[PDB]
């Protein structure tokens, strides 16, 4: 077989079943390029800070999770075509993402009104004119309250990505980069049946509305 990066790349492009394992402690490491250790796992790759169990070096972008808080990929950290990248897993969390800006990786219990206010000092989001569009890739968990993540007053458009349902279930979502400040996204979940293959987490038109 190829590199594992080279893998996880091409599983996400032709819509394989490759999962991801993710070490607790990339969520201690900030936003941006990150040098990781990839390795086999059952089914899939671990992606942690270790250079041991045929572990193979990769340079990726990292977007870590942070328990009643937002964290943001700023844009300007995407550079070199064909990199990976990654957040951790999705458990309630939400993931919002302008194409050619920042992402957000926002946990659960934070309140929709809340988070758009936070996102909404990103320069990124203050160039972002009220009545003109963006594409923007979101994603949340399928029967969460709606006051965690409804954004219908600030955008029109199309519906969100969900993954689980009824409140359960995970999804990971990580990307490849296409050119600067420039990313294609591609996601699975996991449920009862297992996981999923990876699909495209799509970017989608979205008027601002206010």
Request: aromatic share 10%.
């Amino acid at each position: 077989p190829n590199s594992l990066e080279a893998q996880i790349r091409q599983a996400m492009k032709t819509g394989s079943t490759l999962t991801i394992e993710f070490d607790q402690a990339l969520n201690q490491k900030s936003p941006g390029t990150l040098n990781v250790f990839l390795h086999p796992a059952n089914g899939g790759v671990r992606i942690d800070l270790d250079s041991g169990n045929q572990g193979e070096p990769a340079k990726i972008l990292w977007l870590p999770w942070k328990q009643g808080e937002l964290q943001t990929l700023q844009p300007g950290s995407i550079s070199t075509v064909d990199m990976l990248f990654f957040t951790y897993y999705l458990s309630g969390s939400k993931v919002f993402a302008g194409d050619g800006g920042p992402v957000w990786h926002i946990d659960a219990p934070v309140e929709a009104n809340q988070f758009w206010r936070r996102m909404s000092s990103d320069e990124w989001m203050e160039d972002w004119e009220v009545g003109t569009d963006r594409q923007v890739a979101y994603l949340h968990r399928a029967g969460q309250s709606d006051s965690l993540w409804n954004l219908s007053a600030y955008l029109e458009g199309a519906a969100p990505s969900t993954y689980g349902r009824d409140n359960l279930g995970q999804a990971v979502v990580g990307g490849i980069v296409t050119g600067r400040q420039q990313m294609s996204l591609y996601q699975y979940a996991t449920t009862s049946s297992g996981s999923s293959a990876w699909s495209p987490l799509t970017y989608t038109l979205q008027q601002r509305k206010q």
